[PDB]
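Can't attach files on this board, so I'm pasting raw text. These are the components:
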Amino acid sequence: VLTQPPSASGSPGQSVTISCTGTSSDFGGYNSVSWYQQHPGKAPKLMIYEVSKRPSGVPDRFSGSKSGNTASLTVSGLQAEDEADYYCSSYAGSNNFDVFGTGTKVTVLGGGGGSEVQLVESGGGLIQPGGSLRLSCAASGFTVSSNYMSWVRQAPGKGLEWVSVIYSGGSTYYADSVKGRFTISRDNSENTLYLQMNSLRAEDTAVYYCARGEIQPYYYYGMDVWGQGTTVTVSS
Amino acid sequence: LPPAYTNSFTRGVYYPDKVFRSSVLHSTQDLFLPFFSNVTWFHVIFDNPVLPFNDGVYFASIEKSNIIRGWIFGTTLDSKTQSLLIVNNATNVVIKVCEFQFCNDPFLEFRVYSSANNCTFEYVSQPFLMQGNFKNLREFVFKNIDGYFKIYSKHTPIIVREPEDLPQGFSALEPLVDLPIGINITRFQTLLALHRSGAAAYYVGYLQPRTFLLKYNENGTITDAVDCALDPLSETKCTLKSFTVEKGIYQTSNFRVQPTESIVRFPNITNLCPFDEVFNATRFAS
Amino acid sequence: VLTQPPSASGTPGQRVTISCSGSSSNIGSNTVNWYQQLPGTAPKLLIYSNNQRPSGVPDRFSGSKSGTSASLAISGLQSEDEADYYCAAWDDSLNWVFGGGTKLTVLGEVQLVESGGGVVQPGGSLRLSCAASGFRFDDHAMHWVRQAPGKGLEWVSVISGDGGSTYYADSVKGRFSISRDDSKNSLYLQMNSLRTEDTALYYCAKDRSYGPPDVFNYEYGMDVWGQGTTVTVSS
Amino acid sequence: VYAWNRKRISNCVADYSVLYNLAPFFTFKCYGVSPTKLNDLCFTNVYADSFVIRGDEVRQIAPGQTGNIADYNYKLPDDFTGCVIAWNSNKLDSKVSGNYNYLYRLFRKSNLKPFERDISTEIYQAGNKPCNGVAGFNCYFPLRSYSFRPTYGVGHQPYRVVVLSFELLHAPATVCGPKKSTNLVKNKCVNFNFNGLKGTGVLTESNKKFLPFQQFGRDIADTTDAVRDPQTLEILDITPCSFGGVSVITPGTNTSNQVAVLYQGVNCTEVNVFQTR
Ligand SMILES: *[C@@H]1O[C@H](CO)[C@@H](O)[C@H](O)[C@H]1NC(C)=O
Ligand SMILES: *[C@@H]1O[C@H](CO)[C@@H](O)[C@H](O)[C@H]1NC(C)=O
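---
Top answer:
Structure tokens for the assembled complex are below.
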């Protein structure tokens, strides 16, 4: 559980400088606090991973220095037309999920990845409550069996949280939400990598996102590419 | 080389255990060198054969200063199995049971081998194990048991300058090293200090399981030993614990002629089975 | 289970020897801890890891772990050493077994205060709070060590400094929920399925280790205690 | 963690009681046996393997467990008979100058074999491309350094962890443990356990000239008579304890009841009093 401001609209692009408090430490080990810009519709896009050295993108958002006990991402002078949600990641302790933060409305105005590797899902329209549904993110580019991928779900209103982490060949760690009722199983080593529902408990209605890289122990990986999700729409 | 052979006199009676005895006669049963046996006369005037190590050997050396130094005991002398390269370098002895196969040939600088593998023992013994017409004889009884590679030794400064041959006189060997390393060994390889930039000849006997009656001195050393199967007189000296047999007839062990052939005669073959009439017909059954 | 003399005796001037017997599953594989508690006041650490002593504990105490049992020695006891001595050890079955107490009677700065007690309706209960003041809560673990009036002490649950894996006792498992928050020094313990057998003090004990006392079997101890509230359900 | 020592130690008296007071260790969990009984068990050779991990990773060193370090740098099977001795080293392994010296091999292809060391530095190839050496979008450094700093908290500090693997192959054991001793008693029938040679007797001072290699000593007919002191060289003599026959001389139960007691083989000074042959 982290601390983030509910909304931020006063003084658009001049003194916003949103951050995420509630750490009370020195960010544990590797001081790598990522910032995700979740936009309604398409999947979120990476903005910055370290405190500096922003990736290839918009150059008007940098200087995310760790002031006190929080990473103050300087966003002033960026623009005056945006409708998205900024999320920060921290608490890099060993086997600690829910590294994301609460929904921060950083809309300065309010009113006013596709061909990189691949983006595919299963399209779970009208999912029967329970059963066993498999969702895949087949990637014709980067290897779907050697890199470290993850699965993160988000529901309407609530923020994102770590749901599934899978290492190279010998780790199948599960999140604390499922506590064991979720069984990750890798598909063919040269075709794709799918998941398994295993009798959901009416809380898996959130939309899924299969990310090619880790969230809290994030690595550069050349580029951060996401994929559009699908609505579960359980009928319990 | 055509290896010759010499008559090994009474020599090679080592201490079986470490027990003090004063003026007694101890009848031990262990691996000893049979008296009046044949020992190869390998001369080092070039020679380096591979000898079979069945159950124990008796090595000798009449070198002058540093001719015969080192031992290459091992099973296969390959990189698969382990080996033993106990050598005698400058005022030190290096003992490693590492599995150094070979480089080109056992000659010697550590030019004996050139490789690197996993080792199991590095017992570097600091105390080394080794007069015009005064040579030096060095005897070593190498014996391997289930969990010890015991090595005996004795250094006697012989005086006679006769043709190269084993001297006359009893001389026991004193243990110096008790390496507890295990290993399955079976081959013996020797090597000499080449140093190119009748010299010496090593004698290599073979031990056998026999009984020997040893006489201990009042100080605690063995003065002499008598075998039990060498002559009808030694058996009398073994059946009676005394090296001075009185005049008379004494009953020794019994003899029994063991058989040679083995015949097994059974009754005549008759009353065969009618199965031959079963497997040969036209209409058999349904 | 640990065997300890219930009520020993002693004379002034000389020394005594309090012992604590335990099997090889708890003492043989871990280190014993000796705690001293004066009658009326909160307990305090006396000997940890059987070899070292805190800065406040003088050289008047010594401990040994010869074999599978622990042995205490107080060279030159006095009237101030008239207190209760408790043995504690972490067993390999994910539990913290305490002693019974030794009535060694002889007749001749961070506050860890907690609260949240009070008589409540049986069956249900309320939350147990705890607090401190600037002691690096992230780099320390916390224990719940309750003590019934007149009876001994026992371990309830443990939370590590990382905030991940936590352990409970054999009787409070399942119906108890211990957790912390990203706010200032605090500790929240929710209790469920009240059986009226919980009349104790629920000491919010401070530790010095970081992880749970299962991987660090040589540094686990217990720092200065705190004044707990007297919760008496009494059905 | 990617290049850890494998010190094969043998031929010593492993006194594990000393290890409890060398340095202020923070972990002494032994999975195989108990340290009290460990000092009485012989072993062939001990494999010392040391490395440095964080505080939150000490839990990953267990006989069977997954993790970023448990299956990528060092794995222990379900037969570890040693200990997991470890201690914090945040006193000399943390300076504010940039700690780009360690690594933990974040990238790997599969789980390594337990008790294996992979000293490699090739660029990680994530398939579907031949990487003859390049750093972008397909192949990255499979190594990543730590961020140990002095002004940090416990959990992410340099923790030195050293394990002592034990093994018993078809070879005689070398390391057994420390052996104690007691003060010698002379001219008194007591028990002795000298180097396995057990018995009872009166250890007296002899004048026998033992050989420099002989340790024990027997008699004409299978009986120990003298042994060498395992301490500084001294020639003793082992004579059996005081034993004898008791006989009663009695004038008969018809005139009186006074009797005499004769102990055979006793100098009187070892039980009026008279000493006869
Ligand atoms: C053995 O230890 C004792 C006591 O330290 C010492 O005096 C003696 O010289 C040592 N060596 C021998 C000969 O046992
Ligand atoms: C008995 O003891 C006395 C005094 O020590 C001694 O002179 C004498 O020789 C001893 N005799 C025997 C039989 O031990």
